[model samples]
Target: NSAEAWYNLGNAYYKQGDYDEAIEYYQKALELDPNNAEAWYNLGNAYYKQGDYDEAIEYYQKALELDPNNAEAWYNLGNAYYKQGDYDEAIEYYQKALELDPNNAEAKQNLGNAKQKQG
Candidate 1:
């Protein structure tokens, strides 16, 4: 679909470290396909790149509402809560995500990091 086309362009920009530009295309993708879960997820990721945790959480919440099986969304939610100093919630989401994808090293390591903070 055209949305995926736009999303891929966004992905290219994202991989190139031009996050704002990537977000522009991701916006286009969302505009092209309003119900696209990955687009929503990527928007959350873009906000995260800009270090806007609350905004990232907002988008992640939307994405998860649409795609509850999205492991990365769960992981991102964990990170956002963790950054917000909500260790209990972060651990909760991380635990959910790990059961879905045990090999997600970032989430796995961060889960450990959350434990350290709590401990």
Candidate 2:
């Protein structure tokens, strides 16, 4: 199968909250297409679920470089930063995510949390 097909399968697994399975499919997709930004983003998401914040951030940064307008990537990057106790950078990335998607309730809540941490 093509990378896109595997990527879509990974997304399905992720949406079902099967993070490990999602990670497997995402990694397969990456093997097929190493430069696939969406695969990288999904891989980061799976890493985040496993509490591997540093690895998540690394993949998310790669996704960002491939597609800076990926709001979900920014949001997840903020999450990874927040998990690592980098509140300031978390807030910055959350704000960027919100700028791209003002109606993102998760980002809004995360931004508020980050602000509270700063204070």
Candidate 3:
């Protein structure tokens, strides 16, 4: 009951662009249900919004462990690495995202960006 409530609260905050508050509630939900991949994904997104790329990558890795084909996760992972100046790593993730979602325009654009960086 409490986990669902907290999860819902997290969603509300997330929709409002309140990433900090969303992270709090999402973390609480995870404490109640550590295996919730959605919670981990949202937490990773919150970290990404805060420019905490390492934490975003860490949580995104956990999310991918539970849901590997998540195109959004792969896309964001590319962004995390790109922010860290790891163009090769970013390219890897961007490529994975494109594999998962060929229609992803941002992934296509970012893949080019990473490739340019690699060169």
TM-score, every prediction = 0.83, 0.84, 0.95
- Evaluate model 2: give its TM-score: 0.84
Candidate 2 residue lDDT tens string, 45-85: 88898899999999999999999999989999999999988
Top candidate (TM-score): 3
Candidate 3 structure lDDT: 0.92
lDDT of each: 0.90, 0.93, 0.92
Root-mean-square deviation of Cα positions for candidate 3 versus the true structure, in angstroms: 0.9
Stretches > 4 Å off in candidate 3: none
Of 1 and 2, which scores higher on lDDT? 2
Candidate 1 structure quality by residue, lDDT tens digits, 43-113? 89988989989989998998999999999899999999999998888999998898889889999889999
Error of 3 at 66 (Å): 0.4
Of the candidates shown, which would achieve the greatest lDDT relative to the real structure?
2
Residue ranges of candidate 2 with Cα displaced over 4 Å: none
- Candidate 1 — worst ten consecutive residues by lDDT sum? 14-23
